[PDB]
Amino acid sequence: APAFYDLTEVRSFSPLPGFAMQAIQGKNLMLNWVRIEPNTEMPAHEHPHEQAGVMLEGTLELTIGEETRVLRPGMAYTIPGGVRHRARTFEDGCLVLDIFSPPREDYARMAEDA
Amino acid sequence: FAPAFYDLTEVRSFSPLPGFAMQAIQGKNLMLNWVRIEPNTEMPAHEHPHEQAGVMLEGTLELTIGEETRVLRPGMAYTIPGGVRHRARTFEDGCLVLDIFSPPREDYARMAEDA
Ligand code: NI
């Protein structure tokens, strides 16, 4: 079903303190607006889902595999399914758009219940 | 594929049609496409088997998906299932929209490679 979204009206959910997420999806795509509070860590994880990210606001230190990059608006990244990554913010926090294919089923349920 | 980081100032631009300037990157299943559209420009009606989503970054875009028409501005987003007909137009300000495809659009991938 084709759809239009206003993100000011998409309810947010928190999988972990310091994170607020607004997730929408089609069949094979999920878009997730992640607002991360200052000085907050996303613990290291992997998943079969391919992921991409687009910086919108603030600063994010991202580790994908062996690499550690500091990311700001104007930057984007791609992560193959199965590749380990973790992240952290500094003083300013960040807003990052995460993209998954296929959608993350756990976030889908949390978005439904938000 | 291999993990990759991109600086948009370094991603080369291509134009599939007058009034459109694009920068595309892709993983395997995902393509991200930054589309700058000139003022008062029409995107002719099309359908594609690829799934599409879009995120407004700057300006204004009137988008028609199947039966519904909406005017989109930053703060808004859209989803288009594979095969669903859509068209769009800009007004005086033009726009910047982030288009997302799964799987990647073959034509855009080739133009990005040649950019
Ligand atoms: Ni992840």
TrEMBL record, chain B:
Pfam families referenced in this protein's UniProt entry, alphabetically: Cupin_2 (PF07883)
Occurrences of domain Cupin type-2 (ranges): 34-90
Cross-referenced InterPro entries: Bacilysin_H2HPP_isomerase (IPR052535), Cupin_2 (IPR013096), RmlC-like_jellyroll (IPR014710), RmlC_Cupin_sf (IPR011051)
Highest taxon above the source species: Bacteria
PANTHER family from the UniProt entry: H2HPP ISOMERASE
Name this protein carries in UniProt: Cupin 2 conserved barrel domain protein
